[PDB]
PDB file of C-alpha atoms in Angstrom:
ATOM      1  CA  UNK A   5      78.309 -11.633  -6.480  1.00 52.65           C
ATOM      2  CA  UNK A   6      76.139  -9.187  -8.486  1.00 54.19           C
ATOM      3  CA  UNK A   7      75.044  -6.157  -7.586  1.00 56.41           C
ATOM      4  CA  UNK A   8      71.311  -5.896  -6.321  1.00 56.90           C
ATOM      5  CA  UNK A   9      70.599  -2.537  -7.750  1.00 58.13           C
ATOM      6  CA  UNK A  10      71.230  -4.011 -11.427  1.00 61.33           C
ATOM      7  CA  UNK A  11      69.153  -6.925 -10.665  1.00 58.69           C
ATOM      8  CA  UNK A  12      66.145  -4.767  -9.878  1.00 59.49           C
ATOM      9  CA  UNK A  13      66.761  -3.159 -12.726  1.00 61.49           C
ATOM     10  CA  UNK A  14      66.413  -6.391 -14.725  1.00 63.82           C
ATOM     11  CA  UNK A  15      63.338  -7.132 -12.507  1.00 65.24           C
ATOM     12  CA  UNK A  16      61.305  -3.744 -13.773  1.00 65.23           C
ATOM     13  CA  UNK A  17      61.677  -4.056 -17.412  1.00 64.33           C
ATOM     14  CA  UNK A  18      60.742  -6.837 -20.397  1.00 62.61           C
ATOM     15  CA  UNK A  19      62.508  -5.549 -22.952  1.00 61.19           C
ATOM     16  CA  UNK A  20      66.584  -4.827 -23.210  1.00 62.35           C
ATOM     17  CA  UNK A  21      69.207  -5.380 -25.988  1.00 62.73           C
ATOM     18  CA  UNK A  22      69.987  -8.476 -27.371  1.00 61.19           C
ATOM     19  CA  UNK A  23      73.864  -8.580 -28.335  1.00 61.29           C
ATOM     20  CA  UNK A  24      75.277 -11.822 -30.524  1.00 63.09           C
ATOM     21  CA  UNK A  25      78.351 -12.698 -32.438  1.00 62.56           C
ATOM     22  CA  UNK A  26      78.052 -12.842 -36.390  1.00 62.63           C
ATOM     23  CA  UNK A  27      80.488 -14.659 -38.135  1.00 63.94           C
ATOM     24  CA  UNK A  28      82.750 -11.765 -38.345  1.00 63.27           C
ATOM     25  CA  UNK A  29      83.369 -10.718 -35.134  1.00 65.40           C
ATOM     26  CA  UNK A  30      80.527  -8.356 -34.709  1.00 68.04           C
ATOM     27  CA  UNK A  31      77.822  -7.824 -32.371  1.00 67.28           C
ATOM     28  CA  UNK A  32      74.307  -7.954 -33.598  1.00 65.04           C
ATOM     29  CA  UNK A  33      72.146  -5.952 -31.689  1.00 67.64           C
ATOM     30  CA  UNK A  34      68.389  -6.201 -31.525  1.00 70.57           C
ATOM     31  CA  UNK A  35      65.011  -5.067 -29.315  1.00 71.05           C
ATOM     32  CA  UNK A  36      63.966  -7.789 -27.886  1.00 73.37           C
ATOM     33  CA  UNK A  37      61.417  -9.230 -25.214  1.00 73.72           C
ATOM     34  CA  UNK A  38      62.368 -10.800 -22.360  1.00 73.22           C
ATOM     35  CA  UNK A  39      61.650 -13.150 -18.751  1.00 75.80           C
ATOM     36  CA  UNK A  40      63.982 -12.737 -15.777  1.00 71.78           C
ATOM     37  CA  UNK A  41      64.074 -15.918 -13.165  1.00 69.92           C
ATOM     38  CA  UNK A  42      65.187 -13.960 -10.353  1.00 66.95           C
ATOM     39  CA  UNK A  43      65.544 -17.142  -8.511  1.00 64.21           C
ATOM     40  CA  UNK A  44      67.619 -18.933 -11.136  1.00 62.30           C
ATOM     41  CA  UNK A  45      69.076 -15.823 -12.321  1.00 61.43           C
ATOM     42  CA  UNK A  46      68.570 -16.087 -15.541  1.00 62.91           C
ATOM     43  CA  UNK A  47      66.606 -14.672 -18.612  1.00 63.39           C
ATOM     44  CA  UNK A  48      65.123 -16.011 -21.485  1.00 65.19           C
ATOM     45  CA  UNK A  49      63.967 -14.541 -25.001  1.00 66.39           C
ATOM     46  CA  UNK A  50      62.560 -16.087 -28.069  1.00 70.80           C
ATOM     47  CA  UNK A  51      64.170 -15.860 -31.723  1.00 70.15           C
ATOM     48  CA  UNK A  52      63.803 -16.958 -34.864  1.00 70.61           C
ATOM     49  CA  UNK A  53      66.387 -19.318 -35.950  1.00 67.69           C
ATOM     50  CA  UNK A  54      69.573 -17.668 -36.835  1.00 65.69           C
ATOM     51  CA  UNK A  55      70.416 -17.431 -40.397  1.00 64.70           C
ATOM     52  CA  UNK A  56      73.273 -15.687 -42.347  1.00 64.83           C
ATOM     53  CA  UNK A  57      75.918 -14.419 -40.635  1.00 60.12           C
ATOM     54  CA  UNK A  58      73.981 -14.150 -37.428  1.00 59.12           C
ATOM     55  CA  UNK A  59      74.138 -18.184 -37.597  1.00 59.41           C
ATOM     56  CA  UNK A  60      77.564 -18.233 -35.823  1.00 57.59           C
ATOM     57  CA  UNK A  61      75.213 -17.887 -32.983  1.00 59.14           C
ATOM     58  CA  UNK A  62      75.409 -21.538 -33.021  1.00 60.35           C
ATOM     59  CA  UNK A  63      79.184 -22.059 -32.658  1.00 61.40           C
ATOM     60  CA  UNK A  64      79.783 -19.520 -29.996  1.00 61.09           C
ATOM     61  CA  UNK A  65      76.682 -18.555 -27.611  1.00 58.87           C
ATOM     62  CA  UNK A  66      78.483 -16.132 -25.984  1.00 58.87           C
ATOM     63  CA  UNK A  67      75.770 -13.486 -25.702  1.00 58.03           C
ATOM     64  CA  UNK A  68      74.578  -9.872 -23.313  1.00 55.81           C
ATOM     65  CA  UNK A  69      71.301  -7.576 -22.627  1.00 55.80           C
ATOM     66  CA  UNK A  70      70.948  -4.284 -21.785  1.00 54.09           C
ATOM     67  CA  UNK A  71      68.048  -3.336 -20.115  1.00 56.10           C
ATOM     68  CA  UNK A  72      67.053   0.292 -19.054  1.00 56.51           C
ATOM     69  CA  UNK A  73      66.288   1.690 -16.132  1.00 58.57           C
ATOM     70  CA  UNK A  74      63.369   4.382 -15.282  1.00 60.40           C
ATOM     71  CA  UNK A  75      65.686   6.983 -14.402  1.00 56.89           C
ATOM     72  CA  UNK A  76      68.165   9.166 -16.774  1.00 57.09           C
ATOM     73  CA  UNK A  77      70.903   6.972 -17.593  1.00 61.04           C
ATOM     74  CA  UNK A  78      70.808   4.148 -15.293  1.00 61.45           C
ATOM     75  CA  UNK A  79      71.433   0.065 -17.246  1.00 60.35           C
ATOM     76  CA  UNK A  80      72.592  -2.769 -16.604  1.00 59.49           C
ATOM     77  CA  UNK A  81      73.879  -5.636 -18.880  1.00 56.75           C
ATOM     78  CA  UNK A  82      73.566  -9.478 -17.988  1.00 56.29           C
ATOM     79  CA  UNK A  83      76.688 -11.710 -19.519  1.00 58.87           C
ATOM     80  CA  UNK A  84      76.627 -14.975 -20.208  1.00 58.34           C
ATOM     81  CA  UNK A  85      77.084 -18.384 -22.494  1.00 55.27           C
ATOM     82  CA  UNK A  86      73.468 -19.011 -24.039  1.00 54.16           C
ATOM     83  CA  UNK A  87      71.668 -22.531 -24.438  1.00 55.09           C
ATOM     84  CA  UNK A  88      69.594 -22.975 -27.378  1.00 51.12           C
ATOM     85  CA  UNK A  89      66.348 -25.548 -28.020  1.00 49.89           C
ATOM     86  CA  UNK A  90      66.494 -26.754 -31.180  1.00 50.25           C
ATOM     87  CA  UNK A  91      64.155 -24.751 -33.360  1.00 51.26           C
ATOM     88  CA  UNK A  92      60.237 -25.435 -33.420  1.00 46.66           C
ATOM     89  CA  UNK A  93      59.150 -28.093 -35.946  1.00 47.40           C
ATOM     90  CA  UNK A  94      56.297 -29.552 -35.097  1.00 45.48           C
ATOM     91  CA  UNK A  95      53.208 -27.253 -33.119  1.00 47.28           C
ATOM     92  CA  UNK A  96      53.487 -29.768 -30.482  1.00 48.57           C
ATOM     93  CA  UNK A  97      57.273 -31.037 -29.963  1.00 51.69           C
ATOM     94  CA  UNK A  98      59.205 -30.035 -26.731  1.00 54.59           C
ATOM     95  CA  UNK A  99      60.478 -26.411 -28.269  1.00 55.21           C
ATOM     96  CA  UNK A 100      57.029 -25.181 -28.756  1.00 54.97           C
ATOM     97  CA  UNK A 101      55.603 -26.369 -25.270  1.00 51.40           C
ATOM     98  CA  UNK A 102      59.089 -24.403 -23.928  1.00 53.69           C
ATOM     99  CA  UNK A 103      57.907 -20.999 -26.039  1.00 53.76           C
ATOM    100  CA  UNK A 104      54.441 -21.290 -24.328  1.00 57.69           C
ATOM    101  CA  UNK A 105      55.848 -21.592 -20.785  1.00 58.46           C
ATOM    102  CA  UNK A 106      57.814 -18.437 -22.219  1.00 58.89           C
ATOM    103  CA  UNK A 107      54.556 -16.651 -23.265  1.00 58.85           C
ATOM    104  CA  UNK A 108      52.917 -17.831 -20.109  1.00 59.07           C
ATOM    105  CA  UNK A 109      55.794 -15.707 -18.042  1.00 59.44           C
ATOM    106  CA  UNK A 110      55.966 -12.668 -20.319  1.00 58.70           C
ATOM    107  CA  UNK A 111      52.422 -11.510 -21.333  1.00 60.61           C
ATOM    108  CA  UNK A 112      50.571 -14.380 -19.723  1.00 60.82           C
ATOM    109  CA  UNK A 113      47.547 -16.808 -21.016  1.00 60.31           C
ATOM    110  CA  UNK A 114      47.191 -16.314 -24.569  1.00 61.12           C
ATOM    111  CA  UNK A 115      43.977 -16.493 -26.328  1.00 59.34           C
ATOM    112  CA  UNK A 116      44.882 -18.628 -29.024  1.00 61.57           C
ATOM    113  CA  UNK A 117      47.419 -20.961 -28.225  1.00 61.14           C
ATOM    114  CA  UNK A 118      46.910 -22.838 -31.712  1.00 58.74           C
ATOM    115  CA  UNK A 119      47.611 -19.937 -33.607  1.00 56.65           C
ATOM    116  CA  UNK A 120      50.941 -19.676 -31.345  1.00 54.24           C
ATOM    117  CA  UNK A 121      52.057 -23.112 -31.778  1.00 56.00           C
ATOM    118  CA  UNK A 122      52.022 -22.819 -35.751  1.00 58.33           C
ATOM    119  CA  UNK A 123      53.506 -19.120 -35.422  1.00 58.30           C
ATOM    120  CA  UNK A 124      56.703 -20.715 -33.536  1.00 58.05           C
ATOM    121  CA  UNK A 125      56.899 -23.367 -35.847  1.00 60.70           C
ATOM    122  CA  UNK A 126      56.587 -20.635 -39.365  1.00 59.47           C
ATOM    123  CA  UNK A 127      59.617 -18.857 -37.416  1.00 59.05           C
ATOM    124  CA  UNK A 128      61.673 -21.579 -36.738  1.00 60.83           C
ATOM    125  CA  UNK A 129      61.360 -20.112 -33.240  1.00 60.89           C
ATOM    126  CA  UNK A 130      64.501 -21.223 -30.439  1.00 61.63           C
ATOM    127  CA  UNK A 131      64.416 -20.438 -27.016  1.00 57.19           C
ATOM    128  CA  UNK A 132      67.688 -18.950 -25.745  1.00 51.06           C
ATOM    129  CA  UNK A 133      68.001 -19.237 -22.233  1.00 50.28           C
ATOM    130  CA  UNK A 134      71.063 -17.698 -21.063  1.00 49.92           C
ATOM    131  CA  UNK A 135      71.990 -18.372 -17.295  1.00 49.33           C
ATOM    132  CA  UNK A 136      73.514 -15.021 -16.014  1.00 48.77           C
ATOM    133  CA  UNK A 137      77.552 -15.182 -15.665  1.00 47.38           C
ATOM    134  CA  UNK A 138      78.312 -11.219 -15.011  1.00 44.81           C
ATOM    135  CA  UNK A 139      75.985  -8.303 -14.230  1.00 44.67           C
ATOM    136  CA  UNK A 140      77.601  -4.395 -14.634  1.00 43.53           C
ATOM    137  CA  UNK A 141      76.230  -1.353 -15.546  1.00 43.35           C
ATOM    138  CA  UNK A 142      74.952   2.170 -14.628  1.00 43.69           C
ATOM    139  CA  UNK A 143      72.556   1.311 -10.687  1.00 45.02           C
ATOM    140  CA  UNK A 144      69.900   3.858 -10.331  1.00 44.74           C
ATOM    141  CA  UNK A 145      69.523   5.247  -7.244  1.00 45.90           C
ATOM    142  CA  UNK A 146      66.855   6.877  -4.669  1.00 46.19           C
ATOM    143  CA  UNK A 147      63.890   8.524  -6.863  1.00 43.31           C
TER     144      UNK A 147
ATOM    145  CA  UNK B   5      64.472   4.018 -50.060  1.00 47.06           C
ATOM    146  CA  UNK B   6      64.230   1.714 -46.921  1.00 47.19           C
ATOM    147  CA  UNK B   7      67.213   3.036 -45.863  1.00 45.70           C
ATOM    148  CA  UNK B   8      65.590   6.362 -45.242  1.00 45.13           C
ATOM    149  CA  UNK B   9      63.531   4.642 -42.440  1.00 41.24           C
ATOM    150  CA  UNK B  10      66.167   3.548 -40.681  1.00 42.61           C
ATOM    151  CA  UNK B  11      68.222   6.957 -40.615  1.00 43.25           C
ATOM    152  CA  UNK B  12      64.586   8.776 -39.329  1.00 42.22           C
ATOM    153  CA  UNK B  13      65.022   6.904 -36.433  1.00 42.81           C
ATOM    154  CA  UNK B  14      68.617   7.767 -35.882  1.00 44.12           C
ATOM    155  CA  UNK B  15      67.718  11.228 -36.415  1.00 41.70           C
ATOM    156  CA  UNK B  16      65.035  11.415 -34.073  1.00 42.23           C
ATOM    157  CA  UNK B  17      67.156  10.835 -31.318  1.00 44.37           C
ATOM    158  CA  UNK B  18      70.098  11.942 -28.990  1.00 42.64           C
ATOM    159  CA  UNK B  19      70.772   8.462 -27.268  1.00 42.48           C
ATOM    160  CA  UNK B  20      71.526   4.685 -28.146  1.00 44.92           C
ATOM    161  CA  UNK B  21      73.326   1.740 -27.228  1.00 46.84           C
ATOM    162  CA  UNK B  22      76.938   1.584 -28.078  1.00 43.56           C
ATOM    163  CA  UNK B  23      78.368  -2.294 -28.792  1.00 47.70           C
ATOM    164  CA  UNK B  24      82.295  -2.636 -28.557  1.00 43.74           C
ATOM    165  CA  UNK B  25      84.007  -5.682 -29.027  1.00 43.93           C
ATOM    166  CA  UNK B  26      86.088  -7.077 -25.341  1.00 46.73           C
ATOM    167  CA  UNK B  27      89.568  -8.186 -26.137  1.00 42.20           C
ATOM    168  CA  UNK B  28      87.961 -12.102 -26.021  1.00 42.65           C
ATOM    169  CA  UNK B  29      85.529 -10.786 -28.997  1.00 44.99           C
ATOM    170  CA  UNK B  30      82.412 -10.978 -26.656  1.00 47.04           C
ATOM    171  CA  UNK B  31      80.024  -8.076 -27.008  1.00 46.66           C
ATOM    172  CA  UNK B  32      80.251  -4.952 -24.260  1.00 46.84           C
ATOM    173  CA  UNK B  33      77.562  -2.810 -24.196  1.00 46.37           C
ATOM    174  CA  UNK B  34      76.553   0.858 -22.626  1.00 47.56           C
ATOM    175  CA  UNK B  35      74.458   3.590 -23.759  1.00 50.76           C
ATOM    176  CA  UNK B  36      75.553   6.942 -25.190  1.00 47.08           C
ATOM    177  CA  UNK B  37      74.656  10.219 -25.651  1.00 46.35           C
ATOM    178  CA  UNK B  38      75.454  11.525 -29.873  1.00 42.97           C
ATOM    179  CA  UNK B  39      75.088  13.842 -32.215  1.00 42.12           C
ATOM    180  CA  UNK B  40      73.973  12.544 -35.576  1.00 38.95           C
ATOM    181  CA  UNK B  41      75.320  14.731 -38.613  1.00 40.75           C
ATOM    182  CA  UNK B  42      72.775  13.926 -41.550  1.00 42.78           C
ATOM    183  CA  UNK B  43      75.365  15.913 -44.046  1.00 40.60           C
ATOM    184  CA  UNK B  44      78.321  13.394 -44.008  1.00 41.40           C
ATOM    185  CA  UNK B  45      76.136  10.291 -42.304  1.00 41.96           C
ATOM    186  CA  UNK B  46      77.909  10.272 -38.990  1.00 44.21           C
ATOM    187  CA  UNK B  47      77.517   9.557 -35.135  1.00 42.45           C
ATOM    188  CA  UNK B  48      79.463  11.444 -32.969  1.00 41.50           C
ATOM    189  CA  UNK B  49      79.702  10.935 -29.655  1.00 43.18           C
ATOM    190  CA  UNK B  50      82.003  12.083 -26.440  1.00 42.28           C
ATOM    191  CA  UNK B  51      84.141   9.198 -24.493  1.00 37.01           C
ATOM    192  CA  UNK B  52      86.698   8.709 -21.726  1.00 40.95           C
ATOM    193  CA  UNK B  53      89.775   7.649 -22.635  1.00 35.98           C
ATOM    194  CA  UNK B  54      89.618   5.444 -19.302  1.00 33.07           C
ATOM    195  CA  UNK B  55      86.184   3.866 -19.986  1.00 32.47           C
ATOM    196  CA  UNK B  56      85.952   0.049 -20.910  1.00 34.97           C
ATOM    197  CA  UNK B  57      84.617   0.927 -24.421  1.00 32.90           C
ATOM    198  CA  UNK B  58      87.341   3.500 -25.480  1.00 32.32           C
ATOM    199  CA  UNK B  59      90.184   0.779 -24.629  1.00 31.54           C
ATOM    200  CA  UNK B  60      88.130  -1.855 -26.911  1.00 28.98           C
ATOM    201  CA  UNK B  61      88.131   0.554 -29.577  1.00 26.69           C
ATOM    202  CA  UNK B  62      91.568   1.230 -29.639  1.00 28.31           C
ATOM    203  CA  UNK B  63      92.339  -2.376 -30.382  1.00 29.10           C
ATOM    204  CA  UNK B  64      89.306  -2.850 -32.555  1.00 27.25           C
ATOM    205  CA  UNK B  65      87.505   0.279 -33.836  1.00 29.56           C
ATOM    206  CA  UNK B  66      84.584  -1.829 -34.998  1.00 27.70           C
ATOM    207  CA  UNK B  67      80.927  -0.384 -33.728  1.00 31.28           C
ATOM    208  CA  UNK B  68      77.658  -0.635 -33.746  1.00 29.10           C
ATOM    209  CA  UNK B  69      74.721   1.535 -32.198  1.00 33.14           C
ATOM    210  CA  UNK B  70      71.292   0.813 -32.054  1.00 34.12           C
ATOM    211  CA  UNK B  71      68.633   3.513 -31.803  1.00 34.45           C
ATOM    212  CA  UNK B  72      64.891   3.077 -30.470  1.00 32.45           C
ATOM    213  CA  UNK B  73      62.151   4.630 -32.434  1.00 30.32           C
ATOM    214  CA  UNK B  74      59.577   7.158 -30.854  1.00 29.95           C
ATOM    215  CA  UNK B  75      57.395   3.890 -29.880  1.00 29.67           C
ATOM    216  CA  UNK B  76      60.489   2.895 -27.722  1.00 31.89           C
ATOM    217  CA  UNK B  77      59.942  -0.770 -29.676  1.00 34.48           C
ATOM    218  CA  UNK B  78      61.328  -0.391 -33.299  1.00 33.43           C
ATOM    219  CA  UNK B  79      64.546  -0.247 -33.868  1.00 30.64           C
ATOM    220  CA  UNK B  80      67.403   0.910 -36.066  1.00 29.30           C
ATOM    221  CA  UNK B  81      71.215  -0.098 -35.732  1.00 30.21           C
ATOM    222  CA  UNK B  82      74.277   1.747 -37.483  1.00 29.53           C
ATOM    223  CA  UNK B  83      77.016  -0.106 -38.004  1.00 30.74           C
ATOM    224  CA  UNK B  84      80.532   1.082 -38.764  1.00 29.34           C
ATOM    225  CA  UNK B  85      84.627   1.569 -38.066  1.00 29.77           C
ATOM    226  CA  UNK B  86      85.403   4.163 -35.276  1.00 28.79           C
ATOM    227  CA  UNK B  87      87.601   7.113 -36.140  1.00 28.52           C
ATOM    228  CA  UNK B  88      89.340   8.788 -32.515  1.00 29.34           C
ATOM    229  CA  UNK B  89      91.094  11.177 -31.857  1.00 30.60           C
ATOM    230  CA  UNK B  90      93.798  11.710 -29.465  1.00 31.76           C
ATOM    231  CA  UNK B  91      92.465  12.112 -25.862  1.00 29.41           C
ATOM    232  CA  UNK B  92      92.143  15.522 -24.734  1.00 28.11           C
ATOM    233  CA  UNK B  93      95.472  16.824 -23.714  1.00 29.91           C
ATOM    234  CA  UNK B  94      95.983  20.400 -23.889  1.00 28.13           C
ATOM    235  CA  UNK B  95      92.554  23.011 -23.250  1.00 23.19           C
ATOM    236  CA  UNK B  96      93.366  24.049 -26.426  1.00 16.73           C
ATOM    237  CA  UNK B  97      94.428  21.658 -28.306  1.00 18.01           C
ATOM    238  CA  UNK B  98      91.946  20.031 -31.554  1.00 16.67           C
ATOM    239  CA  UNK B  99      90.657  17.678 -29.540  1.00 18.42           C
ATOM    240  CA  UNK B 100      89.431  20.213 -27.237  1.00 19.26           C
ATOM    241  CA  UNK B 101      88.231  22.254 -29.945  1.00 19.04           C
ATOM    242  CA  UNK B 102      86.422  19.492 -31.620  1.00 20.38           C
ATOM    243  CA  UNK B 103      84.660  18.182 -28.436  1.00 21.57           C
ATOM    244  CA  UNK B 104      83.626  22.546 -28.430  1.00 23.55           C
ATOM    245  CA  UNK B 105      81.814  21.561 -31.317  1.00 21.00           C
ATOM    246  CA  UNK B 106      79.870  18.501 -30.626  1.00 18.71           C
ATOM    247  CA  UNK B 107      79.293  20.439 -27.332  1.00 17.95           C
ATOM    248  CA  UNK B 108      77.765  22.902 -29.393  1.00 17.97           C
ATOM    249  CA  UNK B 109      75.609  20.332 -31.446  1.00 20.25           C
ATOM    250  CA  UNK B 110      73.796  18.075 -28.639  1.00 19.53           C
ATOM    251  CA  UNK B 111      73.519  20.525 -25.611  1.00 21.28           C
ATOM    252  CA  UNK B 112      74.007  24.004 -26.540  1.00 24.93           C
ATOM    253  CA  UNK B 113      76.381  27.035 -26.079  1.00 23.03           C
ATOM    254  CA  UNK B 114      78.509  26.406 -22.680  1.00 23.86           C
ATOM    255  CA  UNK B 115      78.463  29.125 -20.105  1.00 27.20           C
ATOM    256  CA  UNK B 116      82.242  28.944 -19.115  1.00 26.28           C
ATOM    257  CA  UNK B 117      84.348  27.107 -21.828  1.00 28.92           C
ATOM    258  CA  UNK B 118      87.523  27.583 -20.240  1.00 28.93           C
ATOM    259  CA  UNK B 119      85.759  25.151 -17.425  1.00 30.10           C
ATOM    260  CA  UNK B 120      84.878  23.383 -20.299  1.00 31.00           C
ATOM    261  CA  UNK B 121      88.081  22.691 -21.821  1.00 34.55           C
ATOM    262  CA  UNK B 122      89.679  22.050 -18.365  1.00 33.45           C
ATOM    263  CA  UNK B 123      87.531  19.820 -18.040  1.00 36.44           C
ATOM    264  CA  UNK B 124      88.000  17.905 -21.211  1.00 38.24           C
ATOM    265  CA  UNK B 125      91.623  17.307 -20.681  1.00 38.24           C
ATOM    266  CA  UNK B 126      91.018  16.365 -16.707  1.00 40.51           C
ATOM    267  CA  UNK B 127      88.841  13.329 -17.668  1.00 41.83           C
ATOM    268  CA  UNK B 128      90.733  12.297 -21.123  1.00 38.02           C
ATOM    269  CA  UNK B 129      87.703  12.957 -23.061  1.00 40.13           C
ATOM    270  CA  UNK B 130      87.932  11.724 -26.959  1.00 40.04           C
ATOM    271  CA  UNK B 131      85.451  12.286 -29.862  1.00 36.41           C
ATOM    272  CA  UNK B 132      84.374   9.366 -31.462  1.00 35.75           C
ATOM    273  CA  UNK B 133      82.891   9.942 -34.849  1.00 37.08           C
ATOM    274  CA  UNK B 134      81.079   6.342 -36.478  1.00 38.49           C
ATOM    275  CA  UNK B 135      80.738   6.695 -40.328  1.00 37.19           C
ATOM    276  CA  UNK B 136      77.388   5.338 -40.661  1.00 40.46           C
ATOM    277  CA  UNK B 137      78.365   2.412 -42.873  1.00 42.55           C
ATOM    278  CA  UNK B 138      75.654  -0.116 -43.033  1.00 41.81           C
ATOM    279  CA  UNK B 139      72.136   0.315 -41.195  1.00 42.50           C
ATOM    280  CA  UNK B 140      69.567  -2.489 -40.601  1.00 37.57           C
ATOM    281  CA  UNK B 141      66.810  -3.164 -38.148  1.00 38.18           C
ATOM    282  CA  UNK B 142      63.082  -2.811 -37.965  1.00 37.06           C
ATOM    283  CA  UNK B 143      61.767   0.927 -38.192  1.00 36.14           C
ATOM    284  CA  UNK B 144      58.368   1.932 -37.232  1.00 37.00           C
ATOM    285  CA  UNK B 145      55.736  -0.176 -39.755  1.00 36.51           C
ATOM    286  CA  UNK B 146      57.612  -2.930 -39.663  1.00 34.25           C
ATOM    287  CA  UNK B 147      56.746  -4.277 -35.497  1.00 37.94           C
TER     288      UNK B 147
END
């Protein structure tokens, strides 16, 4: 169904462009970090919850990355319907354990996960997970 | 002002991600090559009258474009209502002479513009100029 050469595009990067829906219809773009399940084939980011009119986040979860290639102007975008954890509230409830399986795939064993846990928890931290529906782009090619 | 952080960023570069809005209201994104005019606040930027994007801003000229800062992690987004013009349709038409122009602006003086404004009208090409209407995001200092 998708096309390989966007995948592996996904695959060699941790960072792309977040894209929601605010309450009026427009996209709200961001940098953000991210962790592709190649397997499961889908990605994963932390925020902050959404406040404002970035909050309509919650009614429609329709969201898309853009991650960059190595090349000139090679991308590809990943589609989908995001899931949302309910945001951290306690340093030790089921969000925050999510977030450190999160850190754990992204950067790896951190050095202080207490400091973490409280850090989620002070940003009202979700996890989106958003299980990939439709892959296009720009696909690099031989370099 | 604040504000003046967030244009540097635009200013120090020649490419960004371009957000349209699909005719469901979900987010389509691509990156873009522009030309940012500090003396009336604008983006301009080249597209194909063909191209997913250019249809979605036909029916809804709303637009966004985020930026990356030198340190490829901060960030700054413009935000803004589309103005096109007709697609290309004569070599010598003010389309044409416009996309001369912006030509002029991001790569230089062409070698053969008669190639150049065949070449405009073959492929549809329209000039997209984005009024710089609100800018948010998080310029260098601030990740």
């Amino acid at each position: 169904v998708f096309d390989d050469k966007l995948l592996a595009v996904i695959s060699g990067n941790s960072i792309g462009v977040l894209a929601t829906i605010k309450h009026d219809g427009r996209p709200q773009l961001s940098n953000v970090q991210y962790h592709f399940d190649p397997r499961k084939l889908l990605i994963q980011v932390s925020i902050a919850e959404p406040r404002a009119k970035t909050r309509n986040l919650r009614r429609d979860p329709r969201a898309s990355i853009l991650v960059d290639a190595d090349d000139g102007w090679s991308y590809a975008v990943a589609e989908g319907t995001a899931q949302l954890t309910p945001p951290a509230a306690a340093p030790d409830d089921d969000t925050v354990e999510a977030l450190i399986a999160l850190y754990r795939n992204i950067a790896g064993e951190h050095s202080d996960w207490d400091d973490y846990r409280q850090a989620m928890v002070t940003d009202r931290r979700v996890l989106l997970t958003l299980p990939i529906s439709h892959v296009y782009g720009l696909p690099p090619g031989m370099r």
